[PDB]
């Protein structure tokens, strides 16, 4: 549940 707004948008499944 870790999504980043910056590009590239990196999202961690937590």
| Integer Cα distance of 10 and 3 in angstroms | 6
Cβ pair 4, 12 in contact under 8 A: no
C-beta separation of 3 from 14 below 8 A:
no
7-14 LR contacts (CB < 8 Å, sep 24+): none
SS3 assignment, position 1: coil
Bridge partners, residue 11, by sequence: 3
Instruction: Dig out the tokens for 3 from the structure.
Output: 């999504």
**For the chain, how big is the Rg over CA atoms in Å?**
7
Q: What letter would DSSP give residue 8? A: S
Whether omega before 3 lies within 30 degrees of 0, making that bond cis, reads: no
Contact between 9 and 2 (Cβ < 8 Å): no
Q: Cβ atoms within 10 A of the Cβ of 13, count?
A: 5
Q: How was this structure determined?
A: NMR
Q: With beta carbons less than 8 A apart as the criterion, state whether 9 and 3 touch.
A: yes
């Amino acid at each position: 549940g870790r999504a980043y707004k910056s590009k590239p948008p990196i999202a961690f499944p937590d």
